Specification:
The complex is a heterodimer. Chain A is mainly alpha-helical. Chain A has a single domain, classed as Growth Hormone, Chain: A (Up-down Bundle). Chain A has five helices and two strands. Chain A has a two-stranded antiparallel sheet. By secondary structure, chain B is mostly helical. Helices cover about 55% and strands about 0% of the residues of chain B. Chain B contains ten helices and no strands. In chain B, helix 1 runs parallel beside helix 3, helix 3 runs parallel beside helix 5 and helix 6 packs parallel to helix 8. The longest helix of chain B has 12 residues. The relative contact order of chain B is 0.11. The chains are: A mainly alpha, B mainly alpha. At the A-B interface, helix 1 and helix 3 of A face helix 5 and helix 7 of B. Chain A: One of its GO terms (molecular function) is interleukin-4 receptor binding. Chain A: Keywords: B-cell activation, Cytokine, Disulfide bond, Glycoprotein, Growth factor, Secreted, Signal. Chain A: It is found in: Secreted. Chain A: Belongs to the IL-4/IL-13 family.
Chain lengths: ~120, ~160
């Protein structure tokens, strides 16, 4: 089993995202992972990319968030979105879920899923 | 190379003067980072057209693909940088370049709701029947993300 280049890059981006403790990484997003019971992997990732897309769209032009550490955050959030095109697809998947998580914790939850997924190439 | 790393950073940051100094001093215009980005990817992504132009004039690879198959054209389409799209296309960018996800620049512009970019891509010969990993065309993707204006434009073709 060859190691997936896509997963590799996604993990690099997630590691970069979760090492920087920026001001606005404490803002909350919908905890889509709470709503992923009997849900496909593709849908879970689409739900996550949708939430992430909404976040970087709304907080790219955010005065409160602004001035260089926020630039890297938005940069890497957009990267993550692109990195997920192959897993999530170019799709929007809204959820009714009310549960909120900090962006930090949301990204940590996604990193865990991806790194578990990546470790399959060690089989 | 240290000069390569400095040029990548200068291109990302939009430091026009520094870009030109580094290139004159020995930086490779096609410097690669560990994710496969070149100075041209970063300048297109961060919307620094003057840097895009300087790089292309001095031999940057207009069709360089990062680790996931994305070209500077994918990136300009993604962030909605219309002039950069136009400049890349004139410099010979593959209008139908595909990444590992099966995504073309027209897919990107269609999903992210960039009508003018869609128009320029179509005129440059973008393939409206191109399918991604999941069998979807730019028109499918536009319609599913609620960009009806773009989806109508594409569905006529």
């Amino acid at each position: 089993h060859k190691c997936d280049i896509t997963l590799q890059e996604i993990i690099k981006t997630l590691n970069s995202l979760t090492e920087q403790k920026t001001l606005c990484t404490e803002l909350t997003v919908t905890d889509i992972f709470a709503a992923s019971k009997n849900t496909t992997e593709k849908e879970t990732f689409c739900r996550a990319a949708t939430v992430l897309r909404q976040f970087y769209s709304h907080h790219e032009k955010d005065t409160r968030c602004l001035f260089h550490r926020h630039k890297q955050l938005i940069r890497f959030l957009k990267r993550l979105d692109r990195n997920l095109w192959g897993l999530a697809g170019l799709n929007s998947c809204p959820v009714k879920e009310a549960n909120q998580s900090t962006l930090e914790n949301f990204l940590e939850r996604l990193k865990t899923i991806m790194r578990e997924k990546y470790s399959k190439c060690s089989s | 190379s240290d000069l390569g790393k400095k040029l990548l950073e200068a291109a990302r940051a939009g430091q026009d003067d520094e870009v030109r100094i580094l290139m004159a001093n020995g930086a490779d215009v096609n410097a690669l980072d560990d994710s496969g980005y070149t100075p041209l990817h970063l300048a297109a992504e961060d919307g620094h057209l003057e840097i895009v132009e300087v790089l292309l004039k001095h031999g940057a690879d207009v069709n360089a693909a990062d680790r996931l198959g994305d070209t500077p054209l994918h990136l300009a389409a993604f962030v909605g940088h219309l002039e950069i799209v136009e400049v890349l296309l004139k410099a010979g960018a593959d209008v139908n370049a595909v990444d590992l996800a099966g995504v073309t620049p027209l897919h990107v512009a269609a999903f992210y709701g960039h009508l003018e970019i869609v128009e320029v891509l179509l005129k440059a010969g973008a393939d409206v029947n191109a399918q991604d990993k999941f069998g979807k065309t730019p028109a499918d993707i536009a319609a599913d993300n609620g960009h009806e204006d773009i989806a109508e434009v594409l569905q006529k073709l």
